[PDB]
Swiss-Prot record:
This is Galectin-3. Probably forms homo- or heterodimers. Interacts with DMBT1. Interacts with CD6 and ALCAM. Forms a complex with the ITGA3, ITGB1 and CSPG4. Interacts with LGALS3BP, LYPD3, ZFTRAF1 and UACA. Interacts with TRIM16; this interaction mediates autophagy of damage endomembranes. Interacts with cargo receptor TMED10; the interaction mediates the translocation from the cytoplasm into the ERGIC (endoplasmic reticulum-Golgi intermediate compartment) and thereby secretion. One of its GO terms (biological process) is epithelial cell differentiation. A motif (Nuclear export signal) lies at residues 114-129. Galactose-specific lectin which binds IgE. May mediate with the alpha-3, beta-1 integrin the stimulation by CSPG4 of endothelial cells migration. Together with DMBT1, required for terminal differentiation of columnar epithelial cells during early embryogenesis. In the nucleus: acts as a pre-mRNA splicing factor. Involved in acute inflammatory responses including neutrophil activation and adhesion, chemoattraction of monocytes macrophages, opsonization of apoptotic neutrophils, and activation of mast cells. The gene is LGALS3. The modification Phosphoserine is found at residue 76. Keywords: Acetylation, Cytoplasm, Differentiation, Disulfide bond, IgE-binding protein, Immunity, Innate immunity, Lectin, mRNA processing, mRNA splicing, Nucleus, Phosphoprotein, Repeat, Secreted, Spliceosome. Its main location: cytoplasm. It comes from Homo sapiens. Residues 6-136 form the Galectin domain. The chain holds residues 114 to 250 of 250 of the full protein. GO terms for cellular component: cell surface; collagen-containing extracellular matrix; cytoplasm; cytosol; extracellular exosome; extracellular region; extracellular space; ficolin-1-rich granule membrane.
Length: 138
């Protein structure tokens, strides 16, 4: 269905009540997935499942400003599985991005980049077969 890396334009940026839905399948022996919500060259929200970081599975979230990564945010819960279909839902809330995988809440990421309506691209990359990527307002 879609070629990765995939660019989803976010016209006029993001805003509370915007829900982004990504459907795909993790490839066999995947190493990484990444969602990059971009404000120009900056990455407002990087969401990065790592399947083998020192033989552990962890999701790393961060922000990139002026080509410099900030302080990462990690939590322990890893709902992805190599070879299996997934759904990622990213709901923009007034103070954070809220992420659910396979209909279960995963994490929140507080807004570091304040100019939400300039976060105008979502890049989708890594070791997936990407089926679809879209948004709606709830």
């Amino acid at each position: 269905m879609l070629i990765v890396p995939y660019n989803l334009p976010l016209p006029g940026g993001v805003v509370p009540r915007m829900l982004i839905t990504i459907l795909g399948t993790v490839k066999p022996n995947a190493n990484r997935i990444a969602l990059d919500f971009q404000r120009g060259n900056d990455v407002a929200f990087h969401f990065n499942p790592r399947f083998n970081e020192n033989n552990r599975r962890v999701i790393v979230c961060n922000t990139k400003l002026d080509n410099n990564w900030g302080r990462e945010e990690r939590q322990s819960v890893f709902p992805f599985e190599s070879g299996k279909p997934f759904k990622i839902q990213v709901l923009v809330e007034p103070d954070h991005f809220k992420v659910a995988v396979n209909d279960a809440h995963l994490l929140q990421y507080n807004h570091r980049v304040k100019k939400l309506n300039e976060i105008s691209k979502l890049g989708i990359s890594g070791d997936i077969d990407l089926t679809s990527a879209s948004y709606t307002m709830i």
